[PDB]
Write a protein that binds this DNA or RNA. Structure first.
Ligand SMILES: [Mg+2]
Ligand SMILES: [Zn+2]
Ligand SMILES: [Zn+2]
Ligand SMILES: [Zn+2]
Length: 89
DNA sequence: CATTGGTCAAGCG
DNA sequence: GCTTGACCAATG
């Protein structure tokens, strides 16, 4: 009744924090505006990209790079999952 | 186990 | 008002 402004247009959920509504709505629309520059990860929320970026390497620690596509990883097992997904040959 | 999407709201000035 | 990151349950 005016608070519709703070309400999700797809499921009727009411928010007090308008930014929570913006992010929630993307779970309906599929919009993923935050794009990793180091892989094809994309997400609905700025801080998820920040969290994701930590999987590409930390400052003081060592980094494992895919020999084929040059992608960097902080965790070797995550590189091997990448190897099997993207370089099956 | 590492990593994720959806959620929540403390804290900032 | 908004950014931020912790929480939780889920995935592989
Ligand atoms: Mg953050
Ligand atoms: Zn909704
Ligand atoms: Zn990435
Ligand atoms: Zn690669």
């Amino acid at each position: 009744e005016g608070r519709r402004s703070d309400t999700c247009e797809y499921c009727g959920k009411v928010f007090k924090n308008c930014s929570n509504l913006t992010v929630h709505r993307r779970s309906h629309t599929g919009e993923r505006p935050y794009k990793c520059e180091l892989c094809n990860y994309a997400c609905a929320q700025s801080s998820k990209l920040t969290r994701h970026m930590k999987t590409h390497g930390q400052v003081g620690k060592d980094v494992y790079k895919c020999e084929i596509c040059k992608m960097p990883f902080s965790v070797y097992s995550t590189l091997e999952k990448h190897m099997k997904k993207w370089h099956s040959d």
